[PDB]
Design a protein around this ligand. Structure first.
Ligand SMILES: *[C@@H]1O[C@H](CO)[C@@H](O)[C@H](O)[C@H]1NC(C)=O
Lengths: 462, 101
């Protein structure tokens, strides 16, 4: 019957047969035609090209070769430099471009034949800012890997102008995995709250060098802007008392999504993750999820456009596609729900700015969901007793309270004696008390320090 | 028969022309600053615009000479943060109070 095929330009690799994005694309294309509910009388076909993702020339060449034959839409590369050429080609030839990864769009680029499935960092940075403000942070150390990281998290970077945050922007060393010098610089600077704008594998890298260095104590809270935090192997960090936090768009809390991800993991049995990499196994990266969702949303959109006589557009001469405008508007207005939750494209942009997030933080188990984030509503973090110990504190004033003169080691309340201890015993035998003496760590009386408006010792402990 | 392409003064078009020139081997002479991704291996291109990796530190030297403790970096477009990224990272190595706008 009627048939249309989708163009696809992905990474050219040799160790693995083909990239994870291509895996997801092929999996979903052979899922659409197999699932008779979606595209019942039309079979989806995949046209796959492999490039270096950095040679925009060969990306343009492959896009032109695909457009020479019948292509309804191009699933462009997952880079920020070869995707611009492909979207320009698609716009000039009037064919939808399908971006599953974030790239910096020029403010004066009047291009409207592309859709960006990746959640816009214009909203993800606001989500990071809301997560920081919820934790009431004051010293925040934004860490990014690529120079485009500042462009990604620019709302977070501009936040100190509005809020009271103190930002110390740092960059991971380039062309090397030596994250130890940067963590050392944090240790000298006593930077405890960190925001990591690095990929999940790189995030696992810095987590490993942080554990090997001493960053995995209780006083370190890590916010990861990456959406693949659930793919990390937090087992070495599970019981370390670390407060690492992140987000997640891959809606794993669903039966259909669980079945899809389990099928994808079962299909992924040829390139297992490296055991000594700090990463999980049998999972699905967010890039594959966005590719799956992209091809699915294009399929559900083209469900409403039965006339799909793909043309033979050339690049030597420019000729807009007769079905390109309506198909592109249909893609932009298309509303589908899948692996990454609700998929709604911004009308004025084509990017996806209205997305549903789930907040992920480290707990006693591995990365439980502790809230949700929506661009409209905002951050939604949901996460006496008679037989209760009465914690008390005291200072070592010799006439008042002093350690009992017993050579035999003694613990609990009995190890403390003095006039104040006698008064506490009298109160306990007068009232109902089950009390334990907890010595003050600061070892001082309360003092209103005008330097920062902070108390200390017993008063602050109270 | 052209010996060198004096490509466009815009990031996307300059990147496209630079990739084409690198593929075909002809030099691509660009006179405007554009963000070259780190892993890019294009060789047939030279940029005459003063590298903001070396000019943002000139701005930082000016700030040091004036002994500023609080600075407000104001930029226009989103690719302005990636231009003066050394100036943004400076507060780590110095004593500044950047209030980027
Ligand atoms: C937050 O999430 C809880 C649980 O899903 C829900 O009951 C509540 O209505 C949500 N609040 C907002 C403001 O979305």
């Amino acid at each position: 019957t009627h048939v249309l095929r989708f163009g696809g330009i992905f990474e050219y690799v040799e160790s693995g047969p083909m990239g994870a994005e291509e895996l997801a694309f092929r999996f979903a294309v052979n899922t659409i035609n197999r699932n008779r509910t979606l595209l019942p009388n039309t079979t989806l076909t995949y046209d796959t090209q492999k490039i270096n993702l950095y040679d925009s020339f060969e990306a343009s060449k492959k896009a032109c070769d695909q457009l020479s034959l019948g292509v309804a839409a191009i699933f462009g590369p997952s880079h920020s430099s070869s995707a611009n050429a492909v979207q320009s080609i698609c716009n000039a030839l009037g064919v939808p471009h399908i971006q599953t990864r974030w790239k910096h769009q020029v403010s004066d680029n009047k291009d409207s034949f592309y859709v960006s499935l990746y959640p816009d960092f214009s909203s993800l940075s606001r989500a990071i800012l809301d997560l920081v403000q919820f934790f009431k942070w004051k010293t925040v150390t934004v860490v990014y890997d690529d120079s485009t990281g500042l462009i990604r998290l620019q709302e977070l970077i501009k936040a100190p102008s509005r809020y009271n945050l103190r930002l110390k922007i740092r960059q991971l060393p380039a062309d090397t995995k030596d994250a130890k010098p940067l963590l050392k610089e944090m240790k000298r600077g006593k930077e405890f709250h960190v925001i990591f704008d690095c990929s999940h594998e790189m995030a696992a890298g810095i987590l490993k060098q942080a554990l090997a260095m001493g960053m995995m104590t209780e006083y370190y809270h890590y916010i990861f802007t990456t959406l693949d935090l659930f793919a990390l192997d937090v087992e070495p960090y599970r019981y370390s008392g670390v407060n690492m936090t992140g987000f997640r768009i891959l809606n794993t809390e669903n039966t259909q999504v669980s079945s899809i991800i389990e099928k994808w993991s079962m299909e992924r049995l040829q390139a297992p993750p490296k055991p000594d990499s700090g990463l999980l196994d049998g999972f699905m990266t967010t890039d594959a999820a966005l590719m799956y969702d992209a091809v699915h949303v294009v399929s559900v959109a083209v469900q409403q456009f039965p006339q799909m006589t793909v043309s033979s557009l050339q690049c030597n001469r420019h000729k807009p596609w007769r079905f390109g405008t309506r198909f592109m508007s249909l893609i932009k207005e298309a509303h589908w729900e899948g692996l990454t939750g609700r998929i709604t494209f911004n009308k004025t942009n084509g990017l996806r700015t209205d997305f549903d997030l789930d907040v992920i933080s480290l707990k006693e188990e591995g990365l439980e969901k502790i809230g949700t984030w929506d661009p409209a509503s905002g951050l939604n973090m949901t996460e006496s007793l008679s037989n209760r110990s009465l914690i008390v504190t005291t200072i070592l004033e010799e006439p008042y309270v002093l350690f009992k003169k017993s050579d035999k080691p003694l613990y609990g309340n009995d190890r403390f004696e003095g006039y104040c201890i006698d008064l506490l015993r009298e109160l306990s035998t007068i009232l109902g008390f089950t009390y334990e003496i907890r010595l003050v760590e600061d070892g001082k009386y309360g003092a209103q320090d005008d330097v920062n408006g902070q108390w200390n010792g017993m008063v602050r402990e109270l």
